[PDB]
PDB file of C-alpha atoms and ligand atoms in Angstrom:
ATOM      1  CA  UNK N   1     115.468  92.502 113.285  1.00  0.00           C
ATOM      2  CA  UNK N   2     114.582  94.046 110.170  1.00  0.00           C
ATOM      3  CA  UNK N   3     114.874  97.782 110.861  1.00  0.00           C
ATOM      4  CA  UNK N   4     111.278  99.732 110.512  1.00  0.00           C
ATOM      5  CA  UNK N   5     112.486 101.552 107.391  1.00  0.00           C
ATOM      6  CA  UNK N   6     113.654  98.732 105.860  1.00  0.00           C
ATOM      7  CA  UNK N   7     110.479  96.359 106.313  1.00  0.00           C
ATOM      8  CA  UNK N   8     108.463  99.931 105.244  1.00  0.00           C
ATOM      9  CA  UNK N   9     110.361  99.702 101.558  1.00  0.00           C
ATOM     10  CA  UNK N  10     109.815  95.859 101.470  1.00  0.00           C
ATOM     11  CA  UNK N  11     106.541  95.878 102.219  1.00  0.00           C
ATOM     12  CA  UNK N  12     105.164  99.300 100.573  1.00  0.00           C
ATOM     13  CA  UNK N  13     107.890 100.060  97.532  1.00  0.00           C
ATOM     14  CA  UNK N  14     108.002  98.568  94.078  1.00  0.00           C
ATOM     15  CA  UNK N  15     109.334 101.646  92.021  1.00  0.00           C
ATOM     16  CA  UNK N  16     110.362  99.278  89.130  1.00  0.00           C
ATOM     17  CA  UNK N  17     106.745  99.369  87.246  1.00  0.00           C
ATOM     18  CA  UNK N  18     104.722 102.558  86.801  1.00  0.00           C
ATOM     19  CA  UNK N  19     101.381 100.463  87.799  1.00  0.00           C
ATOM     20  CA  UNK N  20      99.826  97.070  88.113  1.00  0.00           C
ATOM     21  CA  UNK N  21     100.543  95.487  84.747  1.00  0.00           C
ATOM     22  CA  UNK N  22      97.391  92.782  85.472  1.00  0.00           C
ATOM     23  CA  UNK N  23      95.453  91.077  88.063  1.00  0.00           C
ATOM     24  CA  UNK N  24      98.241  88.878  88.888  1.00  0.00           C
ATOM     25  CA  UNK N  25     100.248  91.581  90.136  1.00  0.00           C
ATOM     26  CA  UNK N  26      99.325  91.097  93.718  1.00  0.00           C
ATOM     27  CA  UNK N  27      99.578  87.149  94.190  1.00  0.00           C
ATOM     28  CA  UNK N  28     103.602  87.628  92.759  1.00  0.00           C
ATOM     29  CA  UNK N  29     104.163  90.718  94.872  1.00  0.00           C
ATOM     30  CA  UNK N  30     103.141  89.724  98.042  1.00  0.00           C
ATOM     31  CA  UNK N  31     104.508  85.992  97.463  1.00  0.00           C
ATOM     32  CA  UNK N  32     108.332  87.635  96.467  1.00  0.00           C
ATOM     33  CA  UNK N  33     108.213  90.504  99.124  1.00  0.00           C
ATOM     34  CA  UNK N  34     107.578  87.307 101.568  1.00  0.00           C
ATOM     35  CA  UNK N  35     104.331  88.109 102.862  1.00  0.00           C
ATOM     36  CA  UNK N  36     102.682  85.086 102.775  1.00  0.00           C
ATOM     37  CA  UNK N  37     105.059  83.317 104.969  1.00  0.00           C
ATOM     38  CA  UNK N  38     103.053  81.585 107.490  1.00  0.00           C
ATOM     39  CA  UNK N  39      99.797  83.610 106.625  1.00  0.00           C
ATOM     40  CA  UNK N  40      98.688  85.812 103.944  1.00  0.00           C
ATOM     41  CA  UNK N  41      98.699  89.176 104.607  1.00  0.00           C
ATOM     42  CA  UNK N  42      95.532  90.706 104.333  1.00  0.00           C
ATOM     43  CA  UNK N  43      95.743  93.965 102.716  1.00  0.00           C
ATOM     44  CA  UNK N  44      99.132  95.732 101.600  1.00  0.00           C
ATOM     45  CA  UNK N  45      99.659  98.888  99.284  1.00  0.00           C
ATOM     46  CA  UNK N  46     102.492  98.968  96.660  1.00  0.00           C
ATOM     47  CA  UNK N  47     103.979 102.541  95.796  1.00  0.00           C
ATOM     48  CA  UNK N  48     104.771 103.162  91.909  1.00  0.00           C
ATOM     49  CA  UNK N  49     107.032 106.040  92.880  1.00  0.00           C
ATOM     50  CA  UNK N  50     110.973 106.693  93.377  1.00  0.00           C
ATOM     51  CA  UNK N  51     111.815 105.996  96.904  1.00  0.00           C
ATOM     52  CA  UNK N  52     113.085 109.342  97.012  1.00  0.00           C
ATOM     53  CA  UNK N  53     109.806 110.596  96.418  1.00  0.00           C
ATOM     54  CA  UNK N  54     108.177 108.431  98.895  1.00  0.00           C
ATOM     55  CA  UNK N  55     110.776 109.510 101.551  1.00  0.00           C
ATOM     56  CA  UNK N  56     109.723 113.317 100.636  1.00  0.00           C
ATOM     57  CA  UNK N  57     106.618 112.771 101.925  1.00  0.00           C
ATOM     58  CA  UNK N  58     107.894 112.377 106.065  1.00  0.00           C
ATOM     59  CA  UNK N  59     108.042 116.599 104.763  1.00  0.00           C
ATOM     60  CA  UNK N  60     105.203 116.985 103.164  1.00  0.00           C
ATOM     61  CA  UNK N  61     101.530 117.966 104.988  1.00  0.00           C
ATOM     62  CA  UNK N  62     101.449 116.766 108.388  1.00  0.00           C
ATOM     63  CA  UNK N  63      97.990 114.524 109.251  1.00  0.00           C
ATOM     64  CA  UNK N  64      96.388 112.604 112.130  1.00  0.00           C
ATOM     65  CA  UNK N  65      97.381 108.979 111.590  1.00  0.00           C
ATOM     66  CA  UNK N  66      93.900 106.649 112.022  1.00  0.00           C
ATOM     67  CA  UNK N  67      95.510 105.518 115.966  1.00  0.00           C
ATOM     68  CA  UNK N  68      95.553 109.286 116.712  1.00  0.00           C
ATOM     69  CA  UNK N  69      99.489 109.823 116.569  1.00  0.00           C
ATOM     70  CA  UNK N  70     100.917 113.077 114.968  1.00  0.00           C
ATOM     71  CA  UNK N  71     103.680 111.653 112.932  1.00  0.00           C
ATOM     72  CA  UNK N  72     101.617 110.783 110.048  1.00  0.00           C
ATOM     73  CA  UNK N  73     102.119 113.041 106.352  1.00  0.00           C
ATOM     74  CA  UNK N  74     100.017 113.273 103.679  1.00  0.00           C
ATOM     75  CA  UNK N  75     101.546 113.597  99.838  1.00  0.00           C
ATOM     76  CA  UNK N  76     100.754 116.607  98.069  1.00  0.00           C
ATOM     77  CA  UNK N  77     100.622 114.864  95.010  1.00  0.00           C
ATOM     78  CA  UNK N  78      98.503 111.795  93.674  1.00  0.00           C
ATOM     79  CA  UNK N  79     101.312 108.898  93.390  1.00  0.00           C
ATOM     80  CA  UNK N  80     100.215 105.246  91.418  1.00  0.00           C
ATOM     81  CA  UNK N  81      99.886 102.492  93.657  1.00  0.00           C
ATOM     82  CA  UNK N  82      98.409  99.184  93.646  1.00  0.00           C
ATOM     83  CA  UNK N  83      96.190  97.848  97.008  1.00  0.00           C
ATOM     84  CA  UNK N  84      96.557  94.126  97.607  1.00  0.00           C
ATOM     85  CA  UNK N  85      93.481  92.515  99.488  1.00  0.00           C
ATOM     86  CA  UNK N  86      93.058  88.964  99.781  1.00  0.00           C
ATOM     87  CA  UNK N  87      89.766  87.347  98.154  1.00  0.00           C
ATOM     88  CA  UNK N  88      87.375  84.718  99.538  1.00  0.00           C
ATOM     89  CA  UNK N  89      88.777  82.219  97.381  1.00  0.00           C
ATOM     90  CA  UNK N  90      92.425  82.491  99.369  1.00  0.00           C
ATOM     91  CA  UNK N  91      93.453  80.326 101.780  1.00  0.00           C
ATOM     92  CA  UNK N  92      96.864  80.083 103.788  1.00  0.00           C
ATOM     93  CA  UNK N  93      99.046  78.386 101.780  1.00  0.00           C
ATOM     94  CA  UNK N  94      97.440  79.717  97.812  1.00  0.00           C
ATOM     95  CA  UNK N  95      97.147  82.914  99.121  1.00  0.00           C
ATOM     96  CA  UNK N  96      95.111  84.874  96.765  1.00  0.00           C
ATOM     97  CA  UNK N  97      94.838  88.252  96.466  1.00  0.00           C
ATOM     98  CA  UNK N  98      92.554  91.026  94.086  1.00  0.00           C
ATOM     99  CA  UNK N  99      94.878  93.683  92.318  1.00  0.00           C
ATOM    100  CA  UNK N 100      93.158  97.233  92.357  1.00  0.00           C
ATOM    101  CA  UNK N 101      95.464 100.174  91.011  1.00  0.00           C
ATOM    102  CA  UNK N 102      94.745 103.605  91.743  1.00  0.00           C
ATOM    103  CA  UNK N 103      96.378 107.181  91.545  1.00  0.00           C
ATOM    104  CA  UNK N 104      95.721 108.544  95.045  1.00  0.00           C
ATOM    105  CA  UNK N 105      97.422 110.121  98.041  1.00  0.00           C
ATOM    106  CA  UNK N 106      99.595 107.913 100.199  1.00  0.00           C
ATOM    107  CA  UNK N 107      99.655 108.710 103.924  1.00  0.00           C
ATOM    108  CA  UNK N 108     102.458 107.915 105.848  1.00  0.00           C
ATOM    109  CA  UNK N 109     103.856 107.295 109.653  1.00  0.00           C
ATOM    110  CA  UNK N 110     107.428 108.618 109.956  1.00  0.00           C
ATOM    111  CA  UNK N 111     110.271 108.293 112.324  1.00  0.00           C
ATOM    112  CA  UNK N 112     114.041 108.508 112.408  1.00  0.00           C
ATOM    113  CA  UNK N 113     116.486 110.330 112.018  1.00  0.00           C
ATOM    114  CA  UNK N 114     116.762 110.284 108.874  1.00  0.00           C
ATOM    115  CA  UNK N 115     113.311 110.999 109.030  1.00  0.00           C
ATOM    116  CA  UNK N 116     111.733 108.158 107.104  1.00  0.00           C
ATOM    117  CA  UNK N 117     108.573 106.105 106.087  1.00  0.00           C
ATOM    118  CA  UNK N 118     107.940 103.202 108.905  1.00  0.00           C
ATOM    119  CA  UNK N 119     103.740 102.303 108.326  1.00  0.00           C
ATOM    120  CA  UNK N 120     101.988 102.916 105.709  1.00  0.00           C
ATOM    121  CA  UNK N 121      98.652 104.689 107.165  1.00  0.00           C
ATOM    122  CA  UNK N 122      96.103 105.064 104.232  1.00  0.00           C
ATOM    123  CA  UNK N 123      95.499 106.371 100.784  1.00  0.00           C
ATOM    124  CA  UNK N 124      93.184 109.377 100.031  1.00  0.00           C
TER     125      UNK N 124
HETATM  126 CL1   CL G   1     116.129  94.268 105.912  1.00  0.00          CL
HETATM  127 CL1   CL G   2     117.448 100.561 107.012  1.00  0.00          CL
HETATM  128 CL1   CL G   3      98.539  98.817 103.560  1.00  0.00          CL
HETATM  129 CL1   CL G   4     113.106 105.185  90.846  1.00  0.00          CL
END
């Protein structure tokens, strides 16, 4: 079974680009990160910063998570992100995503020792 930290990395880290290159970024990344296996994952955010910088958010501003838990943290700085969301033309298989690039603060839930990101809560 994948660890929670490793699942966060696979679903939400893309340090190899500064920003979504094009409208097909999400179609490609959703497929390559194995987020379209049996179902199209409906919504997923990728963060274009170093893993270290994203991990560091777990020692930044403590904020409530949407679900009311208290282990969420909001990045002090904005980060380059791409939101991927399924379009109306999307029907498994042949998932289809809209790519939206933005520079926003991220909010992650953190857990463990080391205390690292395990869920992507939101961007602001
Ligand atoms: Cl793994
Ligand atoms: Cl791990
Ligand atoms: Cl997400
Ligand atoms: Cl990097």
